[PDB]
Amino acid sequence: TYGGYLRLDQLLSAQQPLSEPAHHDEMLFIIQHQTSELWLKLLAHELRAAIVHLQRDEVWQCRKVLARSKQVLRQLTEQWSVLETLTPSEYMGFRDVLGFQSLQYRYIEFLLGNKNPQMLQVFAYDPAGQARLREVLEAPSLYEEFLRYLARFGHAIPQQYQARDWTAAHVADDTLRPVFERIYENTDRYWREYSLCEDLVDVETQFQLWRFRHMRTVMRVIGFALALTFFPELFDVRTSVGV
Amino acid sequence: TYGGYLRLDQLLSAQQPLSEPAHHDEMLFIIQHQTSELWLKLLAHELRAAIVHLQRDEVWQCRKVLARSKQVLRQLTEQWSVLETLTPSEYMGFRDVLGFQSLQYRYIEFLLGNKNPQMLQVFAYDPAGQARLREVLEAPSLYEEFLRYLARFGHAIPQQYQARDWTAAHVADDTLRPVFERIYENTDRYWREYSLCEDLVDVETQFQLWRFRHMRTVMRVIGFLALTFFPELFDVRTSVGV
Amino acid sequence: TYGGYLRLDQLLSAQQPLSEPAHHDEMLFIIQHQTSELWLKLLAHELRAAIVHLQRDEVWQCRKVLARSKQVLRQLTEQWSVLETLTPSEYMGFRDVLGFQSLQYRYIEFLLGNKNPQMLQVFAYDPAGQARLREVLEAPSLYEEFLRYLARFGHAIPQQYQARDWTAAHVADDTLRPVFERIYENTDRYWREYSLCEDLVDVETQFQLWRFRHMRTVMRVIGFALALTFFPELFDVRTSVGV
Amino acid sequence: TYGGYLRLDQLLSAQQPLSEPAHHDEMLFIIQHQTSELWLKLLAHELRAAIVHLQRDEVWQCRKVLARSKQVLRQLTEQWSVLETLTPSEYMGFRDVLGFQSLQYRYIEFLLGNKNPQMLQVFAYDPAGQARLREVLEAPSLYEEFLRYLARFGHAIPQQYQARDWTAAHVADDTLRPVFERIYENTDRYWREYSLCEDLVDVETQFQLWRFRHMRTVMRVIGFALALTFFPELFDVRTSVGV
Numbered sequence: 011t012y013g014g015y016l017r018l019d020q021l022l023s024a025q026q027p028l029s030e031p032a033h034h035d036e037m038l039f040i041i042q043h044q045t046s047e048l049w050l051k052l053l054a055h056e057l058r059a060a061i062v063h064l065q066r067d068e069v070w071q072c073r074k075v076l077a078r079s080k081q082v083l084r085q086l087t088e089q090w091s092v093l094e095t096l097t098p099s100e101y102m103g104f105r106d107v108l109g110f111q112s113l114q115y116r117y118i119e120f121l122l123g124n125k126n127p128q129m130l131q132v133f134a135y136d137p138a139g140q141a142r143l144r145e146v147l148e149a150p151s152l153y154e155e156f157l158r159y160l161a162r163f164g165h166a167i168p169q170q171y172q173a174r175d176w177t178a179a180h181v182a183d184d185t186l187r188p189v190f191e192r193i194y195e196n197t198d199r200y201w202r203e204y205s206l207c208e209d210l211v212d213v214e215t216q217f218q219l220w221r222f223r224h225m226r227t228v229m230r231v232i233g234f235a236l237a238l239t240f241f242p243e244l245f246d247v248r249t250s251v252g253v
Numbered sequence: 254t255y256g257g258y259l260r261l262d263q264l265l266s267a268q269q270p271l272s273e274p275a276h277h278d279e280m281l282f283i284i285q286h287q288t289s290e291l292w293l294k295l296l297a298h299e300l301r302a303a304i305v306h307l308q309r310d311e312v313w314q315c316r317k318v319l320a321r322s323k324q325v326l327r328q329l330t331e332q333w334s335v336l337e338t339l340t341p342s343e344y345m346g347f348r349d350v351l352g353f354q355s356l357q358y359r360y361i362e363f364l365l366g367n368k369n370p371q372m373l374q375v376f377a378y379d380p381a382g383q384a385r386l387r388e389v390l391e392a393p394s395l396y397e398e399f400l401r402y403l404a405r406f407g408h409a410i411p412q413q414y415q416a417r418d419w420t421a422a423h424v425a426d427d428t429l430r431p432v433f434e435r436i437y438e439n440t441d442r443y444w445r446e447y448s449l450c451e452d453l454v455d456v457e458t459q460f461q462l463w464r465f466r467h468m469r470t471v472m473r474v475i476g477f478l479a480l481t482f483f484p485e486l487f488d489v490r491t492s493v494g495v
Numbered sequence: 496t497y498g499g500y501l502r503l504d505q506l507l508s509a510q511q512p513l514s515e516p517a518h519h520d521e522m523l524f525i526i527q528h529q530t531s532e533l534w535l536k537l538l539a540h541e542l543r544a545a546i547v548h549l550q551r552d553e554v555w556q557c558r559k560v561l562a563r564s565k566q567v568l569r570q571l572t573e574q575w576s577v578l579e580t581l582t583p584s585e586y587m588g589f590r591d592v593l594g595f596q597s598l599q600y601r602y603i604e605f606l607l608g609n610k611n612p613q614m615l616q617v618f619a620y621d622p623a624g625q626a627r628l629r630e631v632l633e634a635p636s637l638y639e640e641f642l643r644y645l646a647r648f649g650h651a652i653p654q655q656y657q658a659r660d661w662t663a664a665h666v667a668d669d670t671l672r673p674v675f676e677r678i679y680e681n682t683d684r685y686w687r688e689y690s691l692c693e694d695l696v697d698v699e700t701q702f703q704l705w706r707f708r709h710m711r712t713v714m715r716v717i718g719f720a721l722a723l724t725f726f727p728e729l730f731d732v733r734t735s736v737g738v
Numbered sequence: 739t740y741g742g743y744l745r746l747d748q749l750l751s752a753q754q755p756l757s758e759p760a761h762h763d764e765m766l767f768i769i770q771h772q773t774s775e776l777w778l779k780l781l782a783h784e785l786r787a788a789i790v791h792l793q794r795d796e797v798w799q800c801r802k803v804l805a806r807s808k809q810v811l812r813q814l815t816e817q818w819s820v821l822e823t824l825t826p827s828e829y830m831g832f833r834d835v836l837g838f839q840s841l842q843y844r845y846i847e848f849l850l851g852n853k854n855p856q857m858l859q860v861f862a863y864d865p866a867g868q869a870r871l872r873e874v875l876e877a878p879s880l881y882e883e884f885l886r887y888l889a890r891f892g893h894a895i896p897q898q899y900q901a902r903d904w905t906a907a908h909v910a911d912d913t914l915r916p917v918f919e920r921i922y923e924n925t926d927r928y929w930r931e932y933s934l935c936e937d938l939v940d941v942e943t944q945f946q947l948w949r950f951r952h953m954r955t956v957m958r959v960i961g962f963a964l965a966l967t968f969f970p971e972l973f974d975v976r977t978s979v980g981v
C-alpha cells in the first residue's frame with residue numbers, strides 16, 4: 011500500500027497542536043517546521059555521499075549528489091513563501107504556548123566546515139545523535155576533502171591539510187589563492203576542478219539565501235544576517251583572477 | 254522542547270527503506286512523497302476553513318485562506334524539481350516496490366468538486382480515512398458553496414443549487430454565463446465577487462499545473478488533464494464582451 | 496503584425512556587445528540588464544497607479560495593482576538565477592570593455608520613500624527624467640499616502656502628516672505605534688487597513704530579497720551591507736502587538 | 739556610460755500603446771512579451787553554441803551552455819505569473835489589437851528539431867528573418883548533432899544520421915533503443931553520454947512546462963496539440979531499461 015510503504019499513519023499523526031481552543035494557524039506553523047526537518051534529513055544524506063565520492067576521486071558521481079543537494083537547498087528556501095502568510099495577529103493566538111534548536115541543521119553546518127566544539131554540549135541529551143555530530147566534528151569537512159582532493163592531483167595545497175586537528179573551524183588561507191588562480195585561468199585544463207569550484211559556490215550561495223529568507227520571515231512575524239562564510243578563498247579569489 | 258513539540262522522534266523514524274542490499278536513491282523517493290503528503294494535509298485544513306468562511310459570507314477571511322492555499326499549491330508544484338533528479342538507472346536499484354494512490358490527494362479533489370463515489374472502494378481499508386471521503390463527498394463542493402454565496406446576494410443562481418445530490422460531480426451550466434458576464438463587465442459594483450472569481454481561477458490553474466508536472470516527472474522516471482473544476486468561470490472568458 | 500506591434504526590430508537591435516572579438520558571454524550580461532530595466536519600467540507604471548488609488552480612497556484597485564507589483568518584484572528577484580551562471584573566467588573575457596546607475600531604479604526607490612535630494616544632480620543630464628524624478632521627490636511617498644489615507648478614516652495619525660516638506664525621507668515616528676497596534680488587534684473592524692499593511696510588508700520584503708540576491712551575485716562574479724527600511728513602524732509594531 | 743552601453747534610449751522607446759484613450763493594462767501586455775522575446779534571443783545564442791561544442795566533441799563546454807540554457811527556459815516559464823494578473827475585464831479595454839506568432843519562438847523549435855517548411859511562408863515579411871529560419875531548417879538538429887557525437891565514440895548509430903535531408907522532422911527510431919539501453923544500464927563507463935542524455939530530458943521537460951503554462955494563461959485571458967516530442971527514444975527507453 012502507498013500508505014504502508016510511506017508509513018503515512020505515523021507521519022500524519024505527528025501533528026499535535028497544543029493551543030487551548032485549537033487555533034487555525036497553528037497547523038501551518040507545525041507542518042512548515044516538519045517539512046523542513048525532513049529535507050534536512052535528505053540533505054545530510056546526499057552530502058555524506060559527496061564526501062565519500064570525493065575521497066574516492068569520483069568526480070561525476072559527487073557532482074551528482076551535489077546537484078541534488080542544491081535542489082533540496084533551493085526547497086528549504088522556497089518554503090518560507092508560505093510561512094510568510096502568517097501575520098502577527100494570527101501568531102498572537104498561539105505564540106503563548108511556546109517559549110528551539112535543530113540537531114540536523116547543526117549537523118549540516120558541521121558538514122560544510124562551520125564547526126564549534128561548544129555545540130556538542132546542549133546536545134548530549136541525545137548521545138546517539140551527539141555521537142553522529144561528534145564524528146563529523148572530528149573529520150575533515152566537505153571543503154577540506156575537496157582540498158585533499160586537489161592535492162591528490164598536482165595542485166599546490168599546503169601540507170598541513172594532509173593531517174591536522176579537524177575540530178577547529180578552517181581559517182582563511184592566503185597560500186590557497188594562487189591554487190584557485192591557476193584553475194580559473196586554465197579552464198580547458200582544469201575543467202573538473204573548475205566545475206567543482208562552481209558547484210561549491212552554488213551550495214554556499216543557495217545556503218546564504220536560505221538563511222537570509224529565514225531572517226526576514228522572523229522579522230515580519232516576531233520582529234526584533236550574518237556574514238559567516240564556508241569557502242573563503244573560493245570567494246576571495248574573485249578579486250585577483252586575471253593577474 | 255523543539256524536538257518534543259514537533260514530535261521529531263516519531264516524524265524522523267517514519268523512513269523505512271526496504272531494499273535488500275539497501276539502495277541510496279530510495280531515501281529521496283520517500284521523503285519526496287512524505288513532505289508532499291504533509292503539504293496536502295495543510296492544504297485540506299485551509300480549504301475547509303475557506304468553505305466555512307464562505308458559508309458565513311466572511312469574504313475577506315475566505316479570500317485569505319485561499320491565498321495561503323495558492324501558496325501551498327505552488328509548493329506542491331515547485332517540489333517535483335528534486336524528484337526529477339532521480340534517473341531510470343537509479344530507480345532500477347529499488348523499483349521492486351508496488352505499482353499507488355493517495356487518500357489525501359483524493360480528498361482535495363472531492364473537496365474541489367470532482368466527485369467520484371467509485372473511489373471510496375479503492376480504500377476498502379482504514380475506514381476512518383475512507384469515512385473522511387464519504388463525508389466530504391456528500392457535502393457541496395468548494396465551488397458550489399460559492400454559487401450559494403452568490404445566490405445570497407441577488408445573482409441569478411438556479412434554484413437547484415439550494416439542495417440536490419451533492420454526490421454527483423458538478424455539470425457545466427449555460428445559465429450561469431450571464432451571471433458572470435454581469436460580474437466581469439461591472440467590476441466596481443461587484444469587486445468582492447470579481448475578486449473571488451479570480452481567486453478560484455488561480456486555484457484551478459495552479460492545481461492543473463501541479464498535475465501536469467507530476468505527469469511529466471513520471472514520464473522521465475518510469476516512462477509510458479481534461480478535468481476542469483470551475484467550467485462556467487473559464488467559459489465566460491469567451492463572451493465577456495457583451 | 497506581432498513583430499510590428501511590439502516593435503521587435505527596434506527591440507532586438509539594441510544589443511551591441513563591444514568586446515573586441517565578440518566574447519560569447521557578453522550577450523547574457525546585456526539582455527540581463529535589459530529585461531531587468533523593462534521590468535523596472537512596468538513597476539513604476541503600476542506603483543504610480545497605486546498612489547492615485549490611495550489618494551482617491553479606492554482600496555481594492557490599490558490593492559490590485561499592488562498584487563501585480565509584487566509579481567514584478569519577484570521577477571526582478573528570480574532573474575538573478577541566470578546571471579549566477581556567469582563565472583569569473585567568462586567575466587574576464589569582456590570585463591575590460593565596460594567601465595552604472597539606473598534612473599528608473601532610483602525612481603522606484605524615491606516612490607517608496609527613500610528620498611535623497613543629492614541624487615537629483617547626478618541626473619542633470621536628461622532634464623526630462625530629472626524632472627520626473629523631482630516630481631516624485633517633492634510629493635508624499637506611497638507609504639505617506641497610505642498614512643494620509645488612514646487619517647481620512649479615524650486613525651490617530653499625527654497632524655503634521657497633512658502637510659510638510661516631503662523632500663526629507665520619512666523619519667521613524669514612535670507616535671505611530673498605537674495606531675498600527677490597534678489595527679492588528681481587531682482584524683474584524685479594520686480588515687481593509689490590515690490588508691494594506693500586509694501588502695506593504697510584502698512589497699518591502701520582496702524588495703529586500705531582491706537587493707540581497709543582487710549583492711550575492713556581485714560577490715560570486717566580481718567579489719570585494721545596507722539595512723535600510725521603507726516602512727519602519729509597520730515592522731516595529733511586531734514587538735508590541737498583543738501585550 | 740550605463741544608458742549608452744545598453745542603448746536604453748532605444749530600449750525604452752520601444753513601447754507603443756495603441757489605446758485611445760490610453761489603457762492602463764496595455765503596458766503589462768507589451769513588456770510581458772518583449773522581456774520574453776529578449777530571453778529567447780539569449781536562448782538561441784546559447785543553443786547555437788551547444789551545437790558547435792557538440793560538433794567539437796567538447797562535452798563539458800556544450801554542457802555548461804546547456805545549464806545556462808535550462809535556467810533561461812525556467813525564466814520563460816516562471817514569467818507567466820505576472821501576465822496571469824491580467825483579467826478579462828482589463829483585457830476588453832484594449833482587446834482591439836489583432837487575431838500573432840513569434841519568429842524567434844519558431845527558430846528555437848527548429849533548433850530542437852521540430853522542423854516544418856510550411857512554417858516558413860508565414861513570416862512572409864522580412865525575408866532576412868525567414869532566412870534565419872531556413873539556414874537552420876536545413877541543418878541538423880541539436881538532437882541530431884548529439885546522435886552524431888555518439889556515432890564518433892562507438893555507439894551503434896544508423897548510417898543515415900551521417901548525411902540526409904535535414905529539412906525533415908526527426909522520426910522516432912526503434913533501432914536507437916538498444917543504444918540508450920546500454921548507456922543507462924552501465925552509467926559508470928558512459929558517464930558523459932549518460933549526462934548529456936539527462937541534460938536533454940531537462941531541456942525538453944522545461945520546454946514542455948513553458949508550453950503548457952502559455953496555454954493555461956491563454957485560457958484564463960482570451961477563451962477556448964502539445965503532444966510534440968523532441969527526443970522520443972530518449973523518453974522511450976525508460977520503459978525497457980530493465981537490467
Ligand SMILES: [Mg+2]
Binds near residue numbers: 016017269271
Ligand atoms: Mg516501509
Ligand SMILES: [Mg+2]
Binds near residue numbers: 022023024025026
Ligand atoms: Mg497528528
Ligand SMILES: [Mg+2]
Binds near residue numbers: 024025027040259260
Ligand atoms: Mg506536532
Ligand SMILES: [Mg+2]
Binds near residue numbers: 015016267268269270
Ligand atoms: Mg517509510
Ligand SMILES: [Mg+2]
Binds near residue numbers: 338473939
Ligand atoms: Mg530523469
Ligand SMILES: [Mg+2]
Binds near residue numbers: 502754756
Ligand atoms: Mg505599437
Ligand SMILES: [Mg+2]
Binds near residue numbers: 509525743745
Ligand atoms: Mg547594447
Ligand SMILES: [Mg+2]
Binds near residue numbers: 595596597600
Ligand atoms: Mg543603480
